[PDB]
Amino acid sequence: WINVMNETKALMKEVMDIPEGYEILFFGGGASLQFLMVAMNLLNKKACYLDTGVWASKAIKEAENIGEVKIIGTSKDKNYTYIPEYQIPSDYDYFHITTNNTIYGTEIRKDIESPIPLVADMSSDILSKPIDISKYSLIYAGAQKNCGAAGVTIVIIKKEILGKVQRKIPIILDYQVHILNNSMYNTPPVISIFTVNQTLKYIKKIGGLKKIQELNEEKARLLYAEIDRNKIFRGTVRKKDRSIMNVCFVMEEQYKQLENEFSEYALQKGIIGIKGHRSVGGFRASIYNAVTIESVQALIKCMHDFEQLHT
């Protein structure tokens, strides 16, 4: 509905500092529909992508169906534990990144510079920190972060980038049409958003994106310090690439045998939901926006006590 959407737009502008020249769109269809719409709308001759995990590789695959794609770095060689070095080529139509790779615990934390239009999938991390929206040509966030509603996918788009593709774009997939019709052309459930309004209202209430990041940074910093001091565990991700939202860790070499015992020790101390993805093993602490500082400290104490128990 026009009023919930329109209020959500003004909350987004305010909370995220979105300046003129950007349109906000709400879609059904999850991130996967954006994987398609991004390429349909922006890939005229060729695009480039950075492959930093599962969702990056899915966005890549979808774009490959539309046209020429150059993957200018992949960290797949070491199971996605770092963000590759890359040089953005100046002759491509756009550069697509995925800024947080949830199950691998890596993140691109800064707003990078780019010689060509920058597209970012911020599905996991969109309202976790301030963004300099001016550096981006298109930011999107959906489908499935994490395990919730049919849901809405947000698109923030610098309208001037559109119009360059020669291919005929079906109307339902053309960003211009959705912009022209105020994001009312093929709406998602009003309930599917109605939440975002609330969520933005909460972020504003608690003190804003800067506050939220400063809190996540503090939590991540306390946990990685423990993982770094603690002889039983090892962080899997290269330091400079460490996510502050998803903190991946595994047993040190000598102690791979204690992996099940720690899961149980932590269970008995009331700590669950830390099992790493199948493809990483070990563990993964999800530091949601306001998971508290205190429960990270409880995981830290549990890790420390476990260490002392086995030395």
Added chain:
Amino acid sequence: WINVMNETKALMKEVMDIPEGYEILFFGGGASLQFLMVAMNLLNKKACYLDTGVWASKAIKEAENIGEVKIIGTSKDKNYTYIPEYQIPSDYDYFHITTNNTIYGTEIRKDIESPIPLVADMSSDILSKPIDISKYSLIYAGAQKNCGAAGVTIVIIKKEILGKVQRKIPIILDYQVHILNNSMYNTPPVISIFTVNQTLKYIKKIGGLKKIQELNEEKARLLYAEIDRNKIFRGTVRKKDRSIMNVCFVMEEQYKQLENEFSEYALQKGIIGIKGHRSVGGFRASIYNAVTIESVQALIKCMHDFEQLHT
């Protein structure tokens, strides 16, 4: 927070007609944590389950780790296109069903009778129709329906069923403890729910669960009628088991060759998001609570026009 949770509880009681003797709990962890908690808390000697799809089979697998499980029917033989016949044995600790099997387009639409405590995973369908909550011992709904927030999992539990398991239940997994502590022991993000409050407020606003079901029934009935009259398509699910929320259909035998052409024809008429799961193929119309009547009619017209074009 106590006030959002507590308001949500009173909205749930009212919207769902939840009588005394039932506790409402909110958890982090998705449906998968309930797969574990259900068995941990209720499986003393043995339980029985009905295998009607992916999530049913996951709940089964998890319970199998805890103790003896009898699968009293499975429709896996025909790729889950029907709900099996079964007889609930009277000597098991509980019977677990999954009432809507999203990707297969099947549903158990009635509240069934049972000689033993009835547990139902209603993750996709919990607020889609009135329920006679008295027939159930435990209803839960999470993790991931469909593609949204970190989210909350709802548990509605007939408190008198608890206490029968001899196994020592870790505190964090013990429903009694969560009940005792008003669902405040290990809370999910307040934002993770805050939505449900809104969603319930909307259901109430629009006229309630009965209204919503009557609308879904009407939509499903118009679409299955077209699928039934229309020579190009076939419903994959046995009539009596047809879901009113997820409507699966495939090309008729003579026309399997036109499957891609129809997807494109529908695209050009503005119709997307109907691709069937990988494991069914064909198509699947998601009739969300208020997807409109009108867009189902638009799919119907598109199907009909396509039929005329190829005869």
